[PDB]
Amino acid sequence: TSNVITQDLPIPVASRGFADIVGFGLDGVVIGRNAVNLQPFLAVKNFAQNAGGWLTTKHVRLIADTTGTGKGDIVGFGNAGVYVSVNNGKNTFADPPKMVIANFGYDAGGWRVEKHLRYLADIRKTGRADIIGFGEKGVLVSRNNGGLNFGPATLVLKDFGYDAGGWRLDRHLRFLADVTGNGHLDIVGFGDKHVFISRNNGDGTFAPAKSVIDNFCIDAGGWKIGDHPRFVADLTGDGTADIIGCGKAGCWVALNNGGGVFGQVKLVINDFGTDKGWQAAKHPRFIADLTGNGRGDVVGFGNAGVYVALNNGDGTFQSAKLVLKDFGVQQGWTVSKHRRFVVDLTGDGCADIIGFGEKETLVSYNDGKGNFGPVKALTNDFSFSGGKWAPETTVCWMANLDS
Template sequence: MWRPGWPDTRPPEVPPRLARATAARIGKQHVRHLERFQARTVDSAPLERGSVFHSNPLGRTFVALLRRVLWLAVSGVVINGCGGEVQAPVREPDLSVKSDALYSENGVQLWSLTDPVIPVCWLTPGYDVDKQLMKESLARTWEFESQVQFTWTEGCPTTGTAKYVRLELIPSAPPDSGGGMVSVGMAGAFRLPSQGRSGYIDLPGTNFSGRLSRLQYLASHELGHVMGFNHEQHRDDAQSPCSANVNLGQAYTRYDRDSLMQSMNACNSNMSEDLSAFDKVGVASVYGPRRWTDQFGTQGETPGEILRQLADVDGDGDDELIYFHGNGVRVAAANASQRTFQVAQVWLADFGTSAGWSGTLHPRSVGDVNGDGLADIVGFGENGVSLSYSTGFSFTPGAFSFVGFHHASPNWPSALAAPRMLEDVNGDGTDDIIGFNGSGTVVSLSQCTGALCTASTQFAAPVVALAAFGSSVAQGGWDGVRHPRRVADVNGDGKADIVGFSEWGVIVALSTSTATTASFAPPALWVADYGADPSVGSWATADYPRYLGDLNADGRADIIGFGHDYVWVSFSTGTTFLPAQRVLKNFTVTGGSWQAAFPRFIGDVDHDGKVDLVGSRPQGTQVFLGKTFDANALAP
């Protein structure tokens, strides 16, 4: 028996997923936090060139070998010499596509987890072309998938207290494949002038076949060490023949044979800068998904007053970011191939706070109400519903549509207590109005398509479509914060269904609506999870938003929940939701310090049919693309 909205007299709330009554439902209960360790003592002696195990021994001397061994004997720094063990660091061998995932050994210190900026200076003059190629490789890999940003300075200071990652370039004799060795993590690689170099990259010889891709690989691999990621063969779950001496540490993703950070003579010959799927999830989990724009940040905002939504307002198939700010509505188009949003344009000087619209009292929603492929604005104002159609490059002036769903009515006291939204509940290709108040579920069907529609003819009169999901005791006592309600097509029939996150789990009422009638089947429990009660996850505050979106492009909306430690998803089968799975350790309270004041929302910004995660915080707006979702990526 489900009992949404009952008074909570149970023990104090615990963060989602930390109290599990039925662990088998979601897999392992215990999740590991990212650990931040102090690095081992950094020896001030500079790293020496040379290697113990070398894929091309030409030009290497016994003296270089001896100096390397002696340096290791007196130094406690955590380093990675690419191609062998940290006990005997060596040059980078060619790696294959078979490797494992991201992890850091104990003692490695990560960089700042918010706005991580890694300053690199070049100890070696010249080599301008190679330096530019390496910068571009970093921009396509780690910077492209996370918040990490490298800065580059020509020439390193020789005195003073300015710290840099002090990188040396060393030419190789043709046709040498090159290699490298660097200290791992911030404490080891971030150095004063008196501490010598942080590491070096041995440039591939000018006649080496595949020199460009090899150089790109070396740059992204070695700077991956600087970010704090060790060689993957040292993980305790690495599998033969790609395993080596185990060094315990923090695994960010599961074992994966495609990582850029694998370095093992036995099984690899890597000649590519490409990050694996698990690399992308791992770096986004550790350092946060890439910031696509400095726009739409939350600095100076009153939480809840400024609204952000994603919808396709120009008909190009990509969702744009719609921003309801003080003076009106701004729209920013996404450029997924460049991981950016374009500069926002003012589409309408209305629906903002300067026009009397309050985020807490007057919700606004964006959806295609007339079936022309362009998402329109519906505003639930003080005295009724206002409508503004999209032209593809602007919104028409807001026009009054009808009296209903408005704040002046006691039935619609606030955006939280009585949520209102747009979705197509009858499958006719136009979005309808759905609202939840003390009477239950109220629907106003869209009844007009095409250019002849007007605000006054667009919607039918509101009706109570289902006596459930309402705020009154008779309706179950649904609370706006503890029990959010969403509307989306979860069974793939083209009609949007009601999904409520109750005290005890996820309740679904499938749409049975027709062209002229709004109706829903009786509510049923689809999964005992994502509820406010501690026994089903303790999803009880606005810090833990839950949404619906199609994660796998199968036509059925799935659950996306931003929990305490992880983003969790549950796929729809059409009759139930599968057990929850972790897909990202960020956009959460412990992963990036996200909270209710930093809105997280969803949409499809890259037109691949899979929902993407978007979040705004003071510094701007970050995106994690749905094509990167992998329920098997994160470490257990």
């Protein structure tokens, strides 16, 4: 297992735990705490389409531990800066939220959802999240200095930026993961001709970017943003992030030697790629630990239902098989209306499947071996419900509120 931050999944969820639902609904933040009587709780009247004027087109809304308590706080990147609603521990969130910094906003620093990435991460391993943004001139970091005091937004690396040199959301990928093996989150960038790494030194600095693979990129191997999803994830159990991507012929991986050196790029699964009919607009794919061994498995929501290929434990894989006859295109699930997640809901380290459907939120539980039980109606809440949870106007995440 590696803790990892991607563009699609900026909020790390524990591989072994009881994931909670956090929804930025139309009228505010709705918490669905993983519990015996799941009931949506309107925790904060803000951070919402119809409370505070929050927009998916202009703002970023996340969950992270900004105080160091181990409790996840609500964080919003608004117009004038970053606002935080502190989780008081005992199921209460501060409302109204407090503005902790005049940077990383639409009006503060000219940040744009179309050009930049903003993440929250404990890059210094101090137990609370720094602000890290992939901006114009490079990677800007504001150190979290306790008590919601954030250091100056500081250009810490002149690379991986819209204007340093030429990073684009329609061409490239920028993730954070420990690939060097020092416990700290590094920068992993899929550029034009190479995957680049910038090592996190440990002390709030990143080394200059270095090329590590001549593949997985738009102009090295023909990897395209829509059609060929790429991931970073521990596939060997050594605790460092390997690389895997769903391409044309199937899934290709390059394994980390444990220090950020990558081996040859090999086809490990002849499925999940375009040759077998997997399309970005229809078929969400994920890497998640479905067997509790700390190694990433491949999960895909295909046409007839969900397909999985299990990791043998060493970065090679078994064949893909259909494991669950639901949550697929045949059953009516769509990327534009519905939300699907692959996360542990039950504390056994084997990821379960939950889907926010048209009118119902459904779940199927992993059996502890990578197989799935009968689908069950968990709640009417969080479902699309004719627009109540439209992707255009709401954001939903799984997160461990108690981490």
